[PDB]
Design an enzyme around this catalytic site. Sequence first.
Site, PDB file in Angstrom:
ATOM      1  N   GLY A   5      80.638 102.584  26.968  1.00 45.16           N
ATOM      2  CA  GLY A   5      80.795 101.448  25.853  1.00 45.16           C
ATOM      3  C   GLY A   5      81.774 100.216  25.580  1.00 45.16           C
TER       4      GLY A   5
ATOM      5  NE  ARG B   1      87.987 102.305  29.902  1.00 46.27           N
ATOM      6  CZ  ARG B   1      89.113 102.613  29.498  1.00 46.27           C
ATOM      7  NH1 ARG B   1      90.210 102.046  30.607  1.00 46.27           N
ATOM      8  NH2 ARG B   1      89.356 103.136  28.079  1.00 46.27           N
TER       9      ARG B   1
ATOM     10  NE  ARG C  87      78.124 108.493  27.107  1.00 49.43           N
ATOM     11  CZ  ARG C  87      78.731 107.752  26.728  1.00 49.43           C
ATOM     12  NH1 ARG C  87      79.031 106.169  27.313  1.00 49.43           N
ATOM     13  NH2 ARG C  87      80.121 107.916  26.056  1.00 49.43           N
TER      14      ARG C  87
ATOM     15  N   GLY D  59      82.187 107.376  30.423  1.00 48.65           N
ATOM     16  CA  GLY D  59      83.233 106.888  29.420  1.00 48.65           C
ATOM     17  C   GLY D  59      84.011 108.011  28.654  1.00 48.65           C
TER      18      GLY D  59
ATOM     19  CD  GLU E 213      77.079 110.992  24.242  1.00 47.50           C
ATOM     20  OE1 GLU E 213      76.912 111.431  23.708  1.00 47.50           O
ATOM     21  OE2 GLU E 213      76.360 110.004  24.917  1.00 47.50           O
ATOM     22  CG  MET E 214      78.807 108.299  19.514  1.00 48.51           C
ATOM     23  SD  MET E 214      79.787 107.515  18.187  1.00 48.51           S
ATOM     24  CE  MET E 214      78.261 106.389  17.101  1.00 48.51           C
TER      25      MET E 214
ATOM     26  CB  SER F 226      90.086 109.946  25.094  1.00 44.31           C
ATOM     27  OG  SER F 226      88.578 110.004  24.279  1.00 44.31           O
ATOM     28  CG  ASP F 227      91.768 112.484  19.406  1.00 46.45           C
ATOM     29  OD1 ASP F 227      92.842 113.135  19.709  1.00 46.45           O
ATOM     30  OD2 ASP F 227      91.281 112.598  18.942  1.00 46.45           O
TER      31      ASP F 227
END
Lengths: 235, 235, 235, 235, 235, 235
Positions: free
Chosen positions: E20, E24, E87, E89, E179-180, E203-204
């Site tokens: 995303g 990055r 993908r 991330g 995710e998205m 990440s969380d």
Amino acid sequence: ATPHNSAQVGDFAETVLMCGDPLRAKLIAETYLENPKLVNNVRGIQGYTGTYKGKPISVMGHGMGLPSICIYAEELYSTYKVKTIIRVGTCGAIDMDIHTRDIVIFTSAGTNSKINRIRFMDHDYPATASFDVVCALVDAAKELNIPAKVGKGFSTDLFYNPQTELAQLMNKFHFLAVEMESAGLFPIADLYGARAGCICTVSDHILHHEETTAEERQNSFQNMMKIALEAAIKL
Amino acid sequence: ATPHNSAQVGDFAETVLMCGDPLRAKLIAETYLENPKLVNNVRGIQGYTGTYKGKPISVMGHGMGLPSICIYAEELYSTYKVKTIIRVGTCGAIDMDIHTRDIVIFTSAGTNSKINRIRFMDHDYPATASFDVVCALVDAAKELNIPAKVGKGFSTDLFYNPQTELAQLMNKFHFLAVEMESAGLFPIADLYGARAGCICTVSDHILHHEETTAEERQNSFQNMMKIALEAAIKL
Amino acid sequence: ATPHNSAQVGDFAETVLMCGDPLRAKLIAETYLENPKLVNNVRGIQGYTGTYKGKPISVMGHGMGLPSICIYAEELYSTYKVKTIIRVGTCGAIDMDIHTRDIVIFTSAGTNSKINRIRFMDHDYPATASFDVVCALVDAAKELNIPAKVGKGFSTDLFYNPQTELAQLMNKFHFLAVEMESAGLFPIADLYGARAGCICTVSDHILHHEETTAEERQNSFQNMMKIALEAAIKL
Amino acid sequence: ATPHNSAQVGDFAETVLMCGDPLRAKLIAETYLENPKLVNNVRGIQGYTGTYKGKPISVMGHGMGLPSICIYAEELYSTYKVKTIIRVGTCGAIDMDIHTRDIVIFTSAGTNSKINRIRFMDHDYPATASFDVVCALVDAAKELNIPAKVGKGFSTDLFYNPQTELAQLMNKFHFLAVEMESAGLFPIADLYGARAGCICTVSDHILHHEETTAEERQNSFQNMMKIALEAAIKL
Amino acid sequence: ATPHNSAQVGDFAETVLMCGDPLRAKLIAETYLENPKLVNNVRGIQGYTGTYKGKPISVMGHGMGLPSICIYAEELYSTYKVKTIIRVGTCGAIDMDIHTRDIVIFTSAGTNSKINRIRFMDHDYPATASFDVVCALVDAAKELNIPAKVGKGFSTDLFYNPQTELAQLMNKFHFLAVEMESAGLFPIADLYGARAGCICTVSDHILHHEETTAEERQNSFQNMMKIALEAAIKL
Amino acid sequence: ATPHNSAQVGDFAETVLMCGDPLRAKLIAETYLENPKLVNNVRGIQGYTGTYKGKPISVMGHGMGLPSICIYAEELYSTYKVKTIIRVGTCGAIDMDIHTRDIVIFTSAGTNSKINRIRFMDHDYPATASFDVVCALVDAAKELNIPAKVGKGFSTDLFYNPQTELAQLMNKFHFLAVEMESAGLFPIADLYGARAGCICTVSDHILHHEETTAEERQNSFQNMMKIALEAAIKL
């Protein structure tokens, strides 16, 4: 007593005949009831209460479309303690074997509306006419010996329907006719533990041009009315 | 003749009684039909054809769920030229006024399935039992003088239903019982210009614990069977 | 122990092979298992438990359609503490590059059913085969060196599908085959923290006429069975 | 000329004010128009045409609910070549900052109906009031210096709404009021390249008990009418 | 060459890693690729092409949400003839057994989006990661001996989700992370006969407060990157 | 302060202009603002805050699609206490009477997304631009005397739309243009009691080939920017 009715509990008979046209309802009251009294005219709805063969009976208009009849039906069942609501009126034929001026008795009604899905957790609710009412309408038809077709009806939200293919689909599944209230009425009757039914005379065909003689359209209407009235007595 | 039937056109009677349990269907054939002959056993479905009071009659299983009965019903109406399919079996009561061992005659069936929405342009199709079949079942009930409840049924895709609130919603709208085939059957009959109906004996209640005496559950079953059989003759 | 199973906790192996045809399941039990014992035959479902290479294994039918297999799978995972359910059977090819008699390993299954939407707050639930099971099926295929195609499957509620355009749409998105249970099975396994998978031999093509030699259809079936059995051992 | 209108092309002004109550429409005609002539009374709809400040203007009822107003609006835009339809009436407040007797100008209307989804390939159609009409209504309000609230409205199919949580949801998103026609009207105007708008006086609040003084409810109504009339002239 | 890409056919490697964050992606290019060249920066998307172990590889951002990645993926597969899109991330954990800094390999992704329903005749499309890509990611994980969790992911349209109950529902069905983009990516790959996959580092956690040590979050990220890179080579 | 923003409460002006292209946003900041300072660049989003005619103003990118802008808008309204978000950018014309390089002011936006249905109990939410913002944009247009078209817009999730018939349907209902954020933005503004609006310059037509002169496309862009800026001051 309500936002759409000025009458009070008791002004309405426990059996109410409802049609879309308020003028039609006025005509019915003056033509078939004895000593009809206007008990409610909020919004010119023409709500009357008189008698048929000694028994109390009320006739009132219900506008057009499910949202409309939904208001009246629930108010009547809930506030006026009505027990039976028989929708009486016109409709558009679908099935090729159904002709203009034909009388149709709804066993149930399909719909393109979202109401029943709203009240039924988004599932398929079968808007079914009260079995007692269907039997009363059919017995009346048989006893009066008036040919009537019994089967599914369809309550549309779109008189002018963009989905023109729907008509042929309905003819394939043999939906008898199309009107705009039954699918809303039937489930509300169930909710109140009350009863509802519908009988209509086909005033026009949606799949082809029909022959409509002047005195044939009235006879058909009067015949439908006799059946509705006699059935009311039986109920 | 078909992927799920080995029999040929003519092996099946024009009136077929169908239940979920193939063993039940075998039992029925051996118990109520004269000279029952196994005409189809693809998938151990137990399809028989014998006679009742001199008339041809077939009994066959239809698995569980709409997708299943949909296969058999359409194959029967289409390939074997069957005219009437009466679903006979058990079901779960919903309405508080319905008790275990009660016989219920479906006027129609609601559903949480997507099938009818698929065949009906995403609108509300009223899965309605053929009026002839409903009348034949009710007349049989009356003539045999066997108490039966007539009303809406519900065909669920989820025997174990996550939406636990649905049950109370159905009780409020007075759905009589729950099974898993009617909503699929009824519309397929309409499509083929044929007839379908359903009669069930409540084997259990979904809203509370019931009393089920050994000989009361069988009587109830035999009674439902008599009604189904006599109605078949009337049809 | 349950409404659809007479067996008791312990009668079933922790790994169960399921197909639609109960007769097929009986055949499988008698042909590939040692000392197969009928542990459940409610509804002639033909549930057996025997051994394969010393290990406990059960084979049982599951009817046709998601509503059906949903009943058995949940009862098995919940009451009989089964850990793995591998659906084994036939299916209809979609993709043009898939030929009759081909073996297909489902990574997942799409569906026109409403079940998963019911259990998943009306969103898109990806009916995904347990990754362990997919790997076990593919490793078995590789080790036995039996050509197999891995990809999406589609569980339909309508064997006879009105939406004839769907087939080409699926071919465009490369859905490998069509059956009637996987999409229901997979999510129920997830719910119980258990595992599910599916392997099928294409018995027919839905987009064109295929060549089906007598001994090629059986070989294909036996090959699929070897893969399913070996994978079961690996699991 | 149509099934619901006896008038002929030319009988209606190009700007038509519509309210639910036909008696209200009759009152409006007799109170604000000069030389009002009844041009259509099919179904006692009370359709009039008179003049306001020398300009032609028509007032007619439209029943209750989207299905109803949908019939009239399309017939008017299509057959009678009407250019502007301004819905004028009452409504129920939602937002806590909206009080009874407040005048509200709809920028748009949400709905729980399925109509727009039917005409819009099942997507989200924004039932938006014609920008010209919104501006004309707001300018009239400003020029007359009559406080008016402008914002979203909501056209419900269920006056008696089972989804009681919806009200608070709407208050959170600040929907100003609730009525039963706008969401149907607006998209039909777009289709005909014509214009539509809506202005209502809040006759009651749905989230709490309000204070309604006799002469305050009428003033509010007369004020809404002035705005509607002046805006009509501007258009 | 396209509305969102200035590069020409050939500028992109046949295998593209997408995240995303464009910054990055820039970091990745400068940190893991040799001789990275910016081939496209329309909308600051940071599209690079360099080499990894002698092989061509491209890294580019894809914004946030399905609508976004849908644009890039289709343009890449269609115009730039890309074959594989992985993908890479971050994501939010759902399942209680998943901890922050954990690496997750998507077998598939569910979604609350309407896209797949739009492309799949309103049915359930199983957004499934290309089996080759899943295997390449898992083999890389195994060979590098980096613990990774494989299972369902969920692509949400609402980072801030109003339906707070959805989280627990997903935990019950054991969805690994959120995710998205995946649910949009996977079906587009199928359409083009190409391949797609997704690997993320958590990440969380969305169901409770987690422990995130400074150097543990980076290690996790670098580990995910190694797996993604090695798998790319294997593909 | 947030997962997608490093700035702190106070860094952003209460009025924020947002476009999809972060480079465009950087350009805008350097071209129209005085003393623009980069207050946030998480994900290269290019968030700036400077001044226009002495007043504080912020410009930032918002990616592409509703899921994206939904993240930024809610974070801005909620955490940074922003009051107005005006989306400024490009779009694709639909209506035949709309030409390339035309400026369009959204009154509202339709969508094929499921977001609003998720936040609105599955009903029709009218994604409506804040009336204050629409008026500010139109007044600016009038005062600057720059021709602008006001009407419905459409926020699509599918730039490459499979439903090719949708375009003509939208032209029939006169949707002015197509973009990918408005329908998501508008309802979030309502939720926070804040304001949102959208103004776009048509960069291309979806129903036919258009004439795009080099200096005409820039003028159009600069004109749209003037309107957006002046309106911001008025707000």
